[PDB]
Design a protein around this ligand. Structure first.
Ligand SMILES: [Ar]
Ligand SMILES: [Ar]
Ligand SMILES: [Cl-]
Ligand SMILES: [Cl-]
Length: 162
């Protein structure tokens, strides 16, 4: 199991523009196109992303490319984020994946707000931080996912993904 497999499991893969649980235009493996309501807006952003007139549809290949970019950017974001970096560097590799998962899903910012869990996580207090992260709009909105991620973080194993 690795970050790619894990997120491919959490985000799925759609070749057509779709709405996320939030109602936002998205495509591929969790690639947010836009927050705007304009589906037209969404196609433009999709065309710009891909480099051609997709007309709202992409190939598998294309989706995997956006995905590759998205993970990479997620990683680089953490590494340049200051609340973030130190936590990440303190972690073992499974747990680092969990953090990347969160950042991909919610952005540096949203991940920034787990200050209290995250400090607990810097302190290696698996149990507490986990219960703390659970009290979040994130968990209440996508509980199954959240649960897999918090288990991975707490445990340092991929059990939740088996
Ligand atoms: Ar956390
Ligand atoms: Ar967590
Ligand atoms: Cl892009
Ligand atoms: Cl979920």
């Amino acid at each position: 199991m690795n970050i790619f497999e894990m997120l491919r499991i959490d985000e799925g893969l759609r070749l057509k523009i779709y709405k996320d649980t939030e109602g936002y235009y998205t495509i591929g493996i969790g690639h947010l196109l836009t927050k705007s309501p304009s589906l037209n807006a969404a196609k433009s952003e999709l065309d710009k992303a891909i480099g051609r007139n997709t007309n709202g549809v992409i190939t598998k290949d294309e989706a995997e490319k956006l995905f590759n970019q998205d993970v990479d950017a997620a990683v680089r974001g953490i590494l340049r984020n200051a609340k973030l970096k130190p936590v990440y560097d303190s972690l073992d590799a499974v747990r680092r994946a969990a953090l990347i998962n969160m950042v991909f899903q919610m952005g540096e910012t949203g991940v920034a707000g787990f200050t209290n869990s995250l400090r607990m996580a810097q302190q290696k207090r698996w149990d507490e931080a986990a219960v703390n992260a659970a009290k979040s709009r994130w968990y209440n909105q996508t509980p199954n996912r959240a649960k897999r991620v918090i288990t991975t973080f707490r445990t340092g194993t991929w059990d939740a993904y088996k």
